[PDB]
Protein backbone atom coordinates (compact mmCIF):
# COMPACT_ATOMS: atom_id res chain seq x y z
CA UNK A 1 0.00 0.00 0.00
CA UNK A 2 2.66 2.44 1.14
CA UNK A 3 5.17 0.16 -0.57
CA UNK A 4 5.74 -1.01 -4.13
CA UNK A 5 4.59 -4.53 -4.90
CA UNK A 6 7.87 -6.44 -5.20
CA UNK A 7 6.54 -10.01 -5.31
CA UNK A 8 6.02 -10.33 -9.04
CA UNK A 9 7.64 -13.54 -10.38
CA UNK A 10 10.82 -11.56 -11.19
CA UNK A 11 12.47 -8.56 -9.49
CA UNK A 12 13.33 -7.20 -12.94
CA UNK A 13 16.23 -6.33 -15.24
CA UNK A 14 19.40 -4.61 -14.17
CA UNK A 15 21.10 -3.12 -17.25
CA UNK A 16 24.71 -2.07 -16.69
CA UNK A 17 26.37 0.11 -19.32
CA UNK A 18 30.09 0.09 -18.64
CA UNK A 19 32.00 2.57 -20.81
CA UNK A 20 35.75 2.32 -20.25
CA UNK A 21 37.39 3.02 -23.59
CA UNK A 22 36.46 5.98 -25.75
CA UNK A 23 37.12 6.76 -29.41
CA UNK A 24 40.44 8.56 -29.86
CA UNK A 25 38.81 11.45 -31.70
CA UNK A 26 36.66 12.36 -28.66
CA UNK A 27 39.77 12.99 -26.57
CA UNK A 28 38.10 11.27 -23.61
CA UNK A 29 40.33 9.38 -21.16
CA UNK A 30 40.00 5.70 -20.33
CA UNK A 31 38.12 5.09 -17.09
CA UNK A 32 40.45 2.81 -15.11
CA UNK A 33 38.61 1.16 -12.23
CA UNK A 34 35.23 0.96 -13.94
CA UNK A 35 35.51 -2.80 -14.48
CA UNK A 36 35.72 -3.19 -10.68
CA UNK A 37 32.46 -1.19 -10.42
CA UNK A 38 30.76 -3.27 -13.11
CA UNK A 39 31.66 -6.59 -11.43
CA UNK A 40 30.65 -5.26 -8.01
CA UNK A 41 27.27 -4.12 -9.37
CA UNK A 42 26.68 -7.43 -11.12
CA UNK A 43 27.24 -9.43 -7.93
CA UNK A 44 25.28 -6.98 -5.82
CA UNK A 45 22.21 -6.97 -8.01
CA UNK A 46 22.47 -10.73 -8.50
CA UNK A 47 22.08 -11.13 -4.74
CA UNK A 48 19.00 -8.89 -4.94
CA UNK A 49 17.61 -11.34 -7.56
CA UNK A 50 17.85 -9.01 -10.57
CA UNK A 51 18.42 -10.32 -14.06
CA UNK A 52 21.70 -8.54 -14.77
CA UNK A 53 22.86 -7.67 -18.28
CA UNK A 54 26.34 -6.10 -18.59
CA UNK A 55 27.23 -4.13 -21.75
CA UNK A 56 30.72 -2.67 -22.39
CA UNK A 57 31.95 0.25 -24.51
CA UNK A 58 28.74 1.28 -26.29
CA UNK A 59 28.53 4.05 -28.87
CA UNK A 60 25.91 6.77 -28.43
CA UNK A 61 23.91 4.98 -31.12
CA UNK A 62 24.15 1.64 -29.32
CA UNK A 63 23.08 3.15 -25.99
CA UNK A 64 19.92 4.63 -27.54
CA UNK A 65 19.14 1.39 -29.39
CA UNK A 66 19.68 -0.70 -26.25
CA UNK A 67 17.38 1.48 -24.18
CA UNK A 68 14.71 1.57 -26.87
CA UNK A 69 14.78 -2.22 -27.17
CA UNK A 70 14.72 -2.84 -23.43
CA UNK A 71 11.77 -0.45 -23.05
CA UNK A 72 9.92 -2.46 -25.70
CA UNK A 73 10.28 -5.75 -23.79
CA UNK A 74 7.32 -7.19 -21.89
CA UNK A 75 8.03 -6.32 -18.24
CA UNK A 76 4.62 -7.56 -17.05
CA UNK A 77 6.09 -10.24 -14.75
CA UNK A 78 8.80 -7.94 -13.32
CA UNK A 79 8.55 -5.79 -10.18
CA UNK A 80 10.92 -3.04 -11.22
CA UNK A 81 13.62 -1.83 -13.59
CA UNK A 82 17.21 -0.78 -12.93
CA UNK A 83 19.68 0.91 -15.23
CA UNK A 84 23.28 1.69 -14.22
CA UNK A 85 25.34 4.08 -16.35
CA UNK A 86 29.12 4.16 -15.89
CA UNK A 87 30.82 6.76 -18.09
CA UNK A 88 32.09 10.27 -18.63
CA UNK A 89 29.37 12.88 -18.39
CA UNK A 90 28.35 16.48 -18.00
CA UNK A 91 25.14 18.00 -16.65
CA UNK A 92 22.20 16.11 -18.16
CA UNK A 93 24.48 13.97 -20.36
CA UNK A 94 26.16 10.55 -20.39
CA UNK A 95 28.85 9.80 -22.98
CA UNK A 96 28.77 6.96 -25.45
CA UNK A 97 32.20 5.92 -26.69
CA UNK A 98 31.89 8.36 -29.62
CA UNK A 99 29.73 11.18 -28.26
CA UNK A 100 27.01 12.32 -25.83
CA UNK A 101 23.53 10.98 -25.07
CA UNK A 102 20.88 13.07 -23.29
CA UNK A 103 19.82 11.41 -20.04
CA UNK A 104 16.32 12.73 -20.76
CA UNK A 105 16.23 10.74 -23.99
CA UNK A 106 17.11 7.54 -22.11
CA UNK A 107 14.57 8.17 -19.34
CA UNK A 108 11.77 9.05 -21.77
CA UNK A 109 11.69 5.50 -23.18
CA UNK A 110 10.41 4.39 -19.78
CA UNK A 111 7.73 7.06 -19.25
CA UNK A 112 4.48 5.69 -17.83
CA UNK A 113 2.76 6.14 -21.20
CA UNK A 114 5.60 4.69 -23.34
CA UNK A 115 6.51 1.57 -21.34
CA UNK A 116 3.12 0.33 -20.22
CA UNK A 117 4.37 -2.86 -18.58
CA UNK A 118 6.45 -0.75 -16.19
CA UNK A 119 3.66 1.74 -15.41
CA UNK A 120 3.30 2.03 -11.63
CA UNK A 121 6.59 0.21 -11.06
CA UNK A 122 9.83 1.78 -9.79
CA UNK A 123 12.33 2.71 -12.49
CA UNK A 124 15.77 3.28 -11.03
CA UNK A 125 18.61 5.00 -12.82
CA UNK A 126 22.03 4.91 -11.14
CA UNK A 127 24.52 7.33 -12.69
CA UNK A 128 28.28 7.33 -12.17
CA UNK A 129 29.47 10.22 -14.37
CA UNK A 130 30.62 13.82 -14.07
CA UNK A 131 27.97 16.54 -13.99
CA UNK A 132 30.33 19.42 -14.73
CA UNK A 133 33.80 20.53 -13.67
CA UNK A 134 33.34 21.98 -10.19
CA UNK A 135 35.42 20.62 -7.30
CA UNK A 136 34.24 20.51 -3.69
CA UNK A 137 36.94 21.77 -1.29
CA UNK A 138 34.98 20.59 1.74
CA UNK A 139 34.88 22.08 5.23
CA UNK A 140 36.57 20.72 8.36
CA UNK A 141 34.23 19.31 11.01
CA UNK A 142 -11.04 6.58 -13.38
CA UNK A 143 -7.53 7.48 -12.25
CA UNK A 144 -4.37 8.51 -14.05
CA UNK A 145 -0.83 8.81 -12.74
CA UNK A 146 1.83 11.21 -14.04
CA UNK A 147 3.94 9.82 -16.89
CA UNK A 148 7.02 11.05 -14.97
CA UNK A 149 6.08 9.27 -11.74
CA UNK A 150 7.96 6.28 -10.22
CA UNK A 151 11.43 7.28 -11.38
CA UNK A 152 14.46 7.56 -9.15
CA UNK A 153 17.75 9.01 -10.39
CA UNK A 154 20.63 8.24 -8.06
CA UNK A 155 23.49 10.51 -9.12
CA UNK A 156 27.03 9.94 -7.89
CA UNK A 157 27.68 13.66 -7.35
CA UNK A 158 26.03 17.07 -6.96
CA UNK A 159 24.89 18.96 -10.06
CA UNK A 160 27.75 20.92 -11.64
CA UNK A 161 30.48 18.77 -10.09
CA UNK A 162 33.03 16.22 -11.17
CA UNK A 163 32.53 12.67 -9.93
CA UNK A 164 35.53 10.77 -8.47
CA UNK A 165 36.74 7.30 -9.45
CA UNK A 166 39.67 5.36 -8.02
CA UNK A 167 41.66 3.41 -10.60
CA UNK A 168 42.22 0.53 -8.18
CA UNK A 169 39.07 0.43 -6.00
CA UNK A 170 36.43 1.71 -8.44
CA UNK A 171 34.32 4.83 -8.13
CA UNK A 172 33.56 6.26 -4.68
CA UNK A 173 29.81 6.15 -5.26
CA UNK A 174 29.55 2.66 -6.71
CA UNK A 175 31.91 1.26 -4.02
CA UNK A 176 29.63 2.78 -1.39
CA UNK A 177 26.35 1.85 -3.07
CA UNK A 178 27.28 -1.83 -3.34
CA UNK A 179 28.52 -1.95 0.26
CA UNK A 180 25.38 -0.36 1.71
CA UNK A 181 23.11 -2.58 -0.39
CA UNK A 182 25.02 -5.67 0.79
CA UNK A 183 24.71 -4.53 4.41
CA UNK A 184 21.21 -3.09 4.51
CA UNK A 185 19.07 -4.37 1.64
CA UNK A 186 17.48 -6.89 4.01
CA UNK A 187 16.87 -4.19 6.66
CA UNK A 188 16.21 -0.71 5.22
CA UNK A 189 13.96 1.05 2.69
CA UNK A 190 15.84 2.16 -0.46
CA UNK A 191 15.87 5.90 0.32
CA UNK A 192 17.40 5.16 3.72
CA UNK A 193 20.04 2.95 2.05
CA UNK A 194 20.88 5.78 -0.36
CA UNK A 195 21.11 8.25 2.55
CA UNK A 196 23.73 5.95 4.10
CA UNK A 197 25.52 5.95 0.73
CA UNK A 198 25.46 9.77 0.86
CA UNK A 199 27.06 9.70 4.30
CA UNK A 200 29.69 7.12 3.35
CA UNK A 201 30.81 9.02 0.25
CA UNK A 202 30.76 12.33 2.09
CA UNK A 203 32.71 11.21 5.13
CA UNK A 204 35.03 8.37 4.14
CA UNK A 205 36.46 9.62 0.86
CA UNK A 206 38.77 12.48 -0.04
CA UNK A 207 40.90 12.82 -3.15
CA UNK A 208 44.67 12.43 -3.11
CA UNK A 209 46.46 14.12 -6.01
CA UNK A 210 49.94 15.36 -6.88
CA UNK A 211 48.06 18.22 -8.55
CA UNK A 212 47.08 20.82 -5.94
CA UNK A 213 44.01 21.83 -7.98
CA UNK A 214 42.60 18.32 -7.63
CA UNK A 215 43.90 17.40 -4.18
CA UNK A 216 41.89 16.97 -0.96
CA UNK A 217 38.52 17.20 -2.69
CA UNK A 218 35.14 15.87 -1.53
CA UNK A 219 31.91 14.51 -2.98
CA UNK A 220 28.23 14.30 -2.06
CA UNK A 221 25.88 12.10 -4.11
CA UNK A 222 22.50 13.44 -5.14
CA UNK A 223 19.28 11.43 -4.79
CA UNK A 224 16.47 12.52 -7.08
CA UNK A 225 13.17 10.79 -6.28
CA UNK A 226 9.86 10.88 -8.08
CA UNK A 227 8.87 7.60 -6.42
CA UNK A 228 5.37 7.33 -4.99
CA UNK A 229 5.95 4.44 -2.59
CA UNK A 230 8.60 2.93 -0.34
CA UNK A 231 10.91 0.42 -2.01
CA UNK A 232 12.07 -2.70 -0.16
CA UNK A 233 14.30 -5.43 -1.57
CA UNK A 234 12.87 -8.05 0.79
Amino acid sequence: DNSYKMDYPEMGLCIIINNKNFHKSTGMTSRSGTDVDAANLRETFRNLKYEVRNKNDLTREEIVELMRDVSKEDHSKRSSFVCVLLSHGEEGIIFGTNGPVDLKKIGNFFRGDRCRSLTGKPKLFIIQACRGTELDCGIETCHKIPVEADFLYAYSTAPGYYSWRNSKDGSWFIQSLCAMLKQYADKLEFMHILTRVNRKVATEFESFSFDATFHAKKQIPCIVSMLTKELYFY
Binding site: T29, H88, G89, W164, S167, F214
Partner: peptide, 4 residues
Protein backbone atom coordinates in the same frame (compact mmCIF):
# COMPACT_ATOMS: atom_id res chain seq x y z
CA UNK B 1 41.89 9.04 -7.72
CA UNK B 2 40.72 10.41 -11.13
CA UNK B 3 37.66 12.51 -12.20
CA UNK B 4 35.02 10.95 -14.59
Amino acid sequence: DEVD
